[PDB]
Amino acid sequence: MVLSEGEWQLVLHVWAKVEADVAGHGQDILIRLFKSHPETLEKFDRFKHLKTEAEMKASEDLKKVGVTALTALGAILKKKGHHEAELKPLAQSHATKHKIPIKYLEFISEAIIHVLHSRHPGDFGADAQGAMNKALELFRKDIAAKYKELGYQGG
Ligand code: HEM
């Protein structure tokens, strides 16, 4: 739903490339996020002593956090918009425990697009980038609605 079937197919085609190395994609996305938007690192209490890129890549904790997150995103993308049951818990934790504003979900979406293009340019051209942006926009719109239902504006 929402995106066309062709758009979902582009999203899931590049996602299959992510699934060849979920850990490495997760590390690179977090490192890109922290470099581009340094305020985001303050949300990760156990990462503040990781001062260099190589320390971040060596951290098993960071790698596991990234795989957990990308696993949840991949499960959501595979629902092709039919994701209320998957978004509800994610909104509860990110609104009420981790305290993540919707803007930070924009920042990580930028980092996702950047890493996917860096690693898979032949499988992530303009049409696929547009499809993935629409899929992440839908994710962000729906999770922002769930934030409000819980009493959080996410601003
Ligand atoms: C695509 C967007 C995201 C997805 C799919 C995602 C998914 C997840 C999942 C599945 C977890 C583990 C369970 C939980 O506590 O909810 C998690 C934990 C966490 N997320 Fe996210 N997340 C996203 C974006 C973000 C962003 C942008 C930030 C901060 C800037 C963030 C901060 C955290 C933190 C601090 C934790 C706790 C990690 C731990 O202590 O192990 N998340 N995330």
Domains contained in the chain, number: 1
Q: Is 41 in the pocket of ligand 1 (CB under 6 A)?
A: no
Query: What CATH number did the domain enclosing 23 receive?
Result: 1.10.490.10
- 109 touches 119 (CB < 8 A): no
**Distance between Cα 94 and ligand 1 center (Å):** 7
How was it solved? X-ray
- 154 belongs to a structural domain: no
Residue 108, in any domain of the structure: yes
> Which residue among 41, 94, 96, 115 is best mutated to probe the pocket of ligand 1, counting the most ligand atoms within 8 A of its Cβ?
94
Whose C-alpha lies nearest to ligand 1, atom 38? Answer: 65
Resolution in A: 1.2
CB of 118 shorter than 6 A to ligand 1: no
Residue ranges making up the domain that contains 70? 5-149
